[PDB]
Design a protein around this ligand. Structure first.
Ligand SMILES: [Zn+2]
Ligand SMILES: [Zn+2]
Lengths: 173, 62, 80, 105, 184
């Protein structure tokens, strides 16, 4: 019993099912403080006691199943819209662990639903953005102070006698 | 071709052979509307590749 | 993980207007985002979203530090 | 080299009394007349000769990565040319798609 | 073959309003198409679905001959060497599993349990085979015995997290978040 409890208490599935059970009040909101509380939480979450678990060979068949069965067919875009995502995600996770029929299509349907939901959540996560516009134009400023090549007259380097300039005399006014 | 037509007019003593030359133009087919469509999620890189606007280049093809 | 209770720099009580400021932001952004998808909002290159008047209407002063920390602080609830 | 007329091997060269004799391992021996009077050779500046860049110069007008210059082709009267610079003496060659080649090539 | 598609004239493309900030949308599209590390998942999935089965079924045909050291009977004296010849015909890799120590069927092993317990996120490998043993005799006669072996698990292969054989591939972002995985 103790080794099995230590094995299963480290399972993320156990934590997820315990959270789902706490949400709808099936187990107390605090972690067990007594062996009786731990035994009760294990019985509620896993569906059977540790002794009747190893007796036999099923494990996933009776893991908690949320009490409120909302309508996930309003996840067809049509409190809510976040409770539905959470409960349907847990239910689909449990279906995955049980190799339920038609799981692969329902998973893609829920993936599209939650992609739309993540689009909403990405809208909520936006902090703003600004573009400095050029007043002459009406869009993002393209004015720069970059170098612009320009073929200068050859007289800027040579005089009318073919000699280079030597700018070594300073004129002060 | 416009260079050839200007040459064919110049060799025939025509004084307005320069009018047959067109200007050179090079451009990309990417437009500001494509940039807006990318941000709206209705245009992907695969659509740009399929429309001949962009292509993939390797260091040996570079 | 949240907008700080007070400004990190000067200690003005920024947080008492944080929650309101958050939700107002969304509404304001919903007015200006257009057809661009949310995650592409920091890429639009045509948006000009100014929160100056909103923060002023909250009563927060015109201090650089306070508005900086109010505007720029990431919310852990929006990423997890 | 010299190729044996029977086994088509590479015959070994020996020198006797002002004559070159080719001896094969099959016993065949032959005398060279004129084309076998070349003991050894060496050419210099191999990385800059004309035969090194013949294919490159032929392909130059079609490679879009080559430098172009604003000059009229004297043959087809196109108004641009392809400028290439070969060698350590920086020899400049202007080539055109029609087949024109400065340096008279 | 001639190319078919003809595009509209380049003289009529209107791009003069393109700003360099608009060109960041092209980078956005490129990164969205390739992901950031999507090549890793694609490469590992190619190894799982196509690479390992090809390597096992094509590059590991065994055909060796060993001297017979058995010399106790007349047939033992006549027999000189035995030819061992086999190849594998079926290769499969599954998702990581764990016993749970209930003397029951295997259960799914989630990545967080592997991280905490110091386990390995490794999925079982199942193999089938055909064996041919041929014994040769001094006169020049040979005897051939063939066997066909049902699929059996040989070992486990490490599974890339987030790939096809990872358990966090049939889960949603909320379910990933609730089993202790980084949902992002
Ligand atoms: Zn402050
Ligand atoms: Zn020419």
């Amino acid at each position: 019993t103790k080794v099995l409890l230590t094995e299963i208490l480290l399972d993320p599935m156990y934590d997820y099912a315990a959270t789902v059970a706490r949400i709808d009040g099936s187990i107390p909101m605090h972690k067990p403080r007594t062996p009786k509380e731990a035994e009760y939480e294990f019985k509620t979450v896993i569906g059977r006691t540790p002794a009747e678990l190893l007796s036999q060979k099923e494990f996933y068949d009776k893991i908690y199943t949320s009490k409120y069965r909302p309508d996930f067919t309003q996840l067809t875009r049509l409190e809510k819209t976040s409770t539905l995502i959470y409960l349907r995600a847990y239910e689909l996770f449990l279906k995955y662990l049980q190799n339920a029929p038609n799981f692969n299509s329902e998973l893609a349907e829920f993936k599209t639903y939650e992609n739309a939901y993540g689009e909403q959540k990405a809208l909520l996560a936006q902090q703003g953005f600004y573009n400095i516009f050029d007043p002459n134009t009406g869009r993002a400023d393209q004015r720069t102070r970059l170098f612009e090549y320009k073929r200068l007259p050859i007289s800027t380097l040579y005089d009318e006698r073919g000699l280079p300039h030597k700018w070594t005399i300073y004129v002060y006014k | 071709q416009a260079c050839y037509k200007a040459a064919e007019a110049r060799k025939k003593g025509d004084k307005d052979w320069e009018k047959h030359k067109i200007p050179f133009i090079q451009n990309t087919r990417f437009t500001p509307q494509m940039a807006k469509d990318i941000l709206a999620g209705t245009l992907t890189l695969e659509d740009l590749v399929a429309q001949g606007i962009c292509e993939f280049i390797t260091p040996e093809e570079a | 993980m949240l907008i700080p209770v007070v400004c990190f720099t000067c200690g003005f009580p920024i947080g008492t207007y944080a929650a309101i400021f958050d939700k107002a932001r969304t509404e304001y952004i919903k007015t200006k985002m257009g057809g661009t998808l949310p995650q592409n909002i920091p890429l639009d290159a045509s948006l000009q979203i100014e929160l100056k008047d909103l923060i002023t209407a909250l009563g927060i002063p015109m201090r650089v530090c306070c508005r900086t920390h109010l505007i720029t602080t990431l919310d852990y609830r929006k990423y997890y | 080299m010299k190729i044996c007329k029977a086994c088509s091997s590479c015959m070994v060269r020996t020198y006797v009394d002002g004559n070159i004799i080719f001896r094969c391992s099959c016993g065949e021996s032959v005398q060279g007349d004129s084309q076998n009077l070349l003991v050894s050779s060496k050419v210099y500046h191999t990385g800059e000769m004309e035969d090194k860049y013949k294919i490159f110069i032929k392909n130059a007008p079609f490679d879009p990565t080559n430098c172009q210059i604003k000059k009229d082709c004297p043959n087809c009267h196109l108004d641009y040319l392809t400028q290439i610079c070969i060698g350590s003496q920086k020899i400049i060659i202007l080539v055109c798609r029609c087949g024109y080649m400065s340096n008279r090539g | 073959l001639r190319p078919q598609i003809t595009y509209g004239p380049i003289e009529t493309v209107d791009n003069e309003e393109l700003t360099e900030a608009d060109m960041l949308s092209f980078i956005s599209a490129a990164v969205n198409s390739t992901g950031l590390i999507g090549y890793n998942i694609k490469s590992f999935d190619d190894l799982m679905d196509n690479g390992i089965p090809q390597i096992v079924k094509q590059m590991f045909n065994v055909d060796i001959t060993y001297k017979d050291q058995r010399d106790h009977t007349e047939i033992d004296k006549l027999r000189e060497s035995v030819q061992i010849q086999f190849n594998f015909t079926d290769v499969n890799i599954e998702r990581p599993q764990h016993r749970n120590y209930s003397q029951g069927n295997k259960i799914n092993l989630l990545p967080n349990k592997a991280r905490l317990c110091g386990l390995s996120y490794s999925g079982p490998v199942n193999l089938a085979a055909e064996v041919i043993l041929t014994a040769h005799y001094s006169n020049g006669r040979q005897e051939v015995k063939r066997a066909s072996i049902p699929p059996f698990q040989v070992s486990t292969f490490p599974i890339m997290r987030g790939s096809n054989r990872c358990h966090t591939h049939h889960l949603s972002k909320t379910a990933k978040k609730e089993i202790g995985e980084d949902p992002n």
